[PDB]
Structure of General control protein GCN4:
Amino acid sequence: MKQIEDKLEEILSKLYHISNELARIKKLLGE
Amino acid sequence: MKQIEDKLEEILSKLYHISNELARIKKLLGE
Amino acid sequence: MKQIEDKLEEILSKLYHISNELARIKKLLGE
Amino acid sequence: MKQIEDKLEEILSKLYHISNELARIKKLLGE
């Protein structure tokens, strides 16, 4: 495991955050 | 677990996507 | 597992670092 | 698990790749 599945869920959530950051950076670069 | 497997796959796959976004940004800045 | 635990921690931690690098880049482009 | 530890190793390796990409992007941005 439950503890491994829970860390995976947290890692995935960081990934969504990073994807959002990249959306913004792209727009700041006019891409 | 199957869920753990799905999540590893999903994490790996989102990481491919992020790696490619970054590669496109690097390509665009290179030009 | 202990190794699996170490690796989840290491992945999570590198993800914090990457998220912050991206945040600094976004901050720098904002200015 | 062995198969989970092996996917974690692969995920970590993508992370190192992304860190390299970010090194280059930073230099392209003069940061």
